[PDB]
Symmetry: D2
Subunit: 224 residues, 4 copies
C-alpha cells in the first residue's frame, strides 16, 4: 500500500474523494461561540471546528491504512498546516496505540518546512532535503488553491529521490486558477472563497479562531 509511482504525485490517483461542500453552504456565525476579537469580522462559518476534527480523524485512519507497518516521514508546511498537522499526528498515534494489529515502527517521523509562495518564486526554510532520499514521504498542507506551492515543492523533493510522495491537505478549492494538482488525502472540497480560522489566516490574522469561516467584506478592509 505505501508504494506509489513518483509520477503520480499531484494526480490524486486512486484517492478517496473528499467531503463535498456545495457552493453557498454555510452555518451562521451567531450559532457558535465567537470570541470578541473575531466577532465583528465573521458572519458565515464554512466548516465548524468540530467538523474539521471529525474529518481529520477519517483522514488519519486512511493514512494509517496506507502506511501500516512502514516508516512514514511527514512534513508539516509551516505556518498554515500547524493545526491540521498537529491533529493528524495525534490521531495517527492514537490509532496505532489502540490498533489490534501491532507494529515496532513508530506511527510517523515528523519534519517541518516553511514555504513562502510568490505568484513565481518559492522560498524554503528547512533542514537539508536529502534526508528524504528513499523514504515514504507525506506532505501536509493546509489548503490547495492554485497548486503552485505543492507543484514546485514537489519537483524539489523528487530531485532527492524519495521512495514515494503523497499529499495530505485539509481543503482543496474548486477554482479555474488551478494547475490541476490534487491531494491524496483531502478533507474537503470547497468553492472558491478565501477562508480564515483553524490556522487559516488573512495577513497573519484569525489563525486562533476555532472555526473555518469566510472572510467578510468588512474584514478584508480592516486587515488588507
Amino acid at each position: 500500500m505505501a508504494s506509489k509511482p513518483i509520477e503520480d504525485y499531484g494526480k490524486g490517483k486512486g484517492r478517496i474523494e473528499p467531503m463535498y461542500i456545495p457552493d453557498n453552504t454555510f452555518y451562521n456565525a451567531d450559532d457558535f461561540l465567537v470570541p470578541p476579537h473575531c466577532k465583528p469580522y465573521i458572519d458565515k462559518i464554512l466548516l465548524p471546528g468540530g467538523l474539521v476534527k471529525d474529518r481529520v480523524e477519517k483522514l488519519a485512519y486512511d493514512i494509517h491504512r496506507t502506511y501500516f507497518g512502514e516508516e512514514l516521514h511527514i512534513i508539516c508546511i509551516l505556518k498554515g498546516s500547524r493545526g491540521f498537522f498537529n491533529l493528524l499526528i495525534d490521531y495517527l498515534a492514537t490509532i496505532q496505540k489502540y490498533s489490534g494489529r501491532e507494529s515496532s515502527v513508530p506511527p510517523f517521523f515528523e519534519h517541518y518546512v516553511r514555504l513562502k509562495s510568490y505568484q513565481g518564486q518559492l522560498t524554503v526554510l528547512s533542514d537539508d532535503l536529502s534526508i528524504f532520499r528513499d523514504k515514504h514521504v507525506l506532505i501536509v498542507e493546509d489548503i490547495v488553491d492554485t497548486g503552485f506551492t505543492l507543484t514546485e515543492f514537489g519537483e524539489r523533493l523528487k530531485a532527492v529521490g524519495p521512495k514515494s510522495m503523497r499529499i495530505a491537505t485539509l481543503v482543496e478549492k474548486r477554482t479555474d486558477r488551478s494547475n490541476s494538482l490534487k491531494g491524496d488525502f483531502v478533507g474537503f472540497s470547497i468553492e472558491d472563497v478565501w477562508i480564515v480560522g483553524c490556522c487559516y489566516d488573512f495577513n497573519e490574522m484569525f489563525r486562533d479562531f476555532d472555526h473555518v469561516a469566510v472572510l467578510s467584506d468588512a474584514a478584508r478592509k480592516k486587515f488588507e
Copy 2:
C-alpha cells in the same frame, strides 16, 4: 439573569433560537470513520459529533451567562441525556474556571432522574424547593416527558425552571426548551447517546435511523 416566572416553563420565552437544520440535509457517512458494529446501518449523518460539540459550547456559554453567580441545580434525564449533560457540565466548569469575573458558588450541582408510556422517575423532588432548576433532555419530540415531569417539579416550588435540550423535532401546539441546540425535521435519530431500542448510543455522530437499522433492531 436567573429569575423567571414558573409559568414560562416549556414556552421557550425569550430564548435564543436554535440552529435551524433544513429538511433533507445530511452528510454522507462514508466521509466519517464509522465503527464496525455500526457500519452496515449508518448512511446519513444529520449532525456530526463535532458540530454537536461546537453547538453545546455555545449553549453552555448562554447557560453560564443566565445563571452567573447563582446556585444552579442541573438534572440529567437518564439514559439519553447523559452525553449532552456530560458535555454541558464540562464546558460550564471550564468556562467558570477561565472566567475573569470570579465566584464562590460552584458552576452547578448535578442530579439524575430516569424514565419509566415512559415518564420521569425522580426520587423526592423536595430538595428543589426554592432552587434554580435546569432540566437537561436529549431531544423533545411531542414534549410529553417534559410536560408531565415539569408539573411534578412545579409542585415543590422551585425558584425557576428552564429546559436545555440538544434537539427539538419539527412535528405538527407544543413545548419548547430554553437552551436548544438544533431544530431538525421529524425523523428518528440515533447516535451520540440517541438510541433505537438501546442500540447506537456509542456511535459518535448523530445519524438518521435507516431502513436496515430499523429492521435489524426493531423489537
Copy 3:
C-alpha cells in the same frame, strides 16, 4: 472472558493497581484551581490528567477481558459518573480504532443510585463501576442483590481503593489506584455534595470539612 460468581469481590487474578505511597501528594498551587475551590484545596493526591492516563489503561484491560462479548456496564451514581464517562469513551474509541473487528457494541450502559430492576442482568456479563471502595459495604451489599438474579458473570471496576485496617476487604477487578486511608474530593468525588466539578483528586482539608459538614 468470564468467571465464577463466587470470585466476586476477591479481585482474583487482577492486575494490581497503581500504588500511591502514604503522604505522597502534589501542591495545589502548581495547578489551576477555580475560585469556589481555592480556599479549600491544598494537597492534590491524583492530578486529573493522571486519572485519565490510568483510566485509559483500565479501559484497555476491560476491552481485552470482554472482547467479542456483550458487556453490560453499571454506573453507580452519582460518584462514579466521571470515571464511568471516561471509561466508556475509551472503550468506544479503542473498539473503533482496533481494526480487529467485532459486530457487538463496546458496551450497553446502565445506571443505579444510592439510598432498581436488576432482572435485566440475568445471564449477562456485568461490570459494576464504582468511584471508590472504602469499607466495601456498598459493593458487597449491591453484589448480593445482583447475584440473586443470576448474571452470567460479575466484575468490579473502581477508580480508587483505600488501604484500611479491615481484614478480608472487598477488592475490585480493574482498579486504578491504591491510596492511603483519607477522605478525597474532586473529579466527581464529593464531601457532602461539594467539590465534584474540581478537575483533580484532592485530600479533604480541615477547612473544607468545617465549612461543608
Copy 4:
C-alpha cells in the same frame, strides 16, 4: 505586567517556581498503556502525559495574566517544543475566549524557529528575526539542560531589540553543567537524567510516546 528589562533575560527574576519533582521519583510504565513500538524500552515514567497537560494549563494561565492586554509574539522552538507549544496556545485561546474580558487583540501571534545546537555552534533556521523589534516575545522550549541553546539564541534575538523577552520551558534540569540560565514560566524541575516521550527524543525516537519517561539502557543500546 508584560514589561521586563532585557538584561533580566535568563534570570527567571520574579518567577513562580516550578513544580519540584524529587530525585528518584517516578511512576511505573506497566500502569500505563504503552504502544508496541515503545514497550520494550520504557520502564520509568517521570511525568505522565496527563500531569504534563494539567501543569501546562497552569502555566498558560500565568502567561495569560502576564501579557493581559498586550500583543504577545510566542516563538516555538522546533522540533522538541511542538507538543508543549501546541498545548500552550490552545489554552491561551480558550482562556481568552471564556474570560470575562472582551479584548480585541488576539491571544497570541505564532512564530516558529528551528534551532540546532552543537556543544560550539548554534544554527538558527527561521524567517527574519527583525519582526520582533519592540515586541513582547515569549520563547517556548522543551527543556533547559545546560542553558547553552537559550543563552545563544537569546543573544541573537536581543540584536533586533524586542520590547521584552521571556522563556517558557516545560522542564528544567537540576544540573552541574548549567550556566545558570533559567526560564520564567517553567512546568517542572527534575533531576539530571535524559528524558524521552511527549516530544522529547533520543536520536529522533520516542517523540510520539504519550508520557515523559527516563531513557532506559535498552533504549540507549537500541537507538545509540
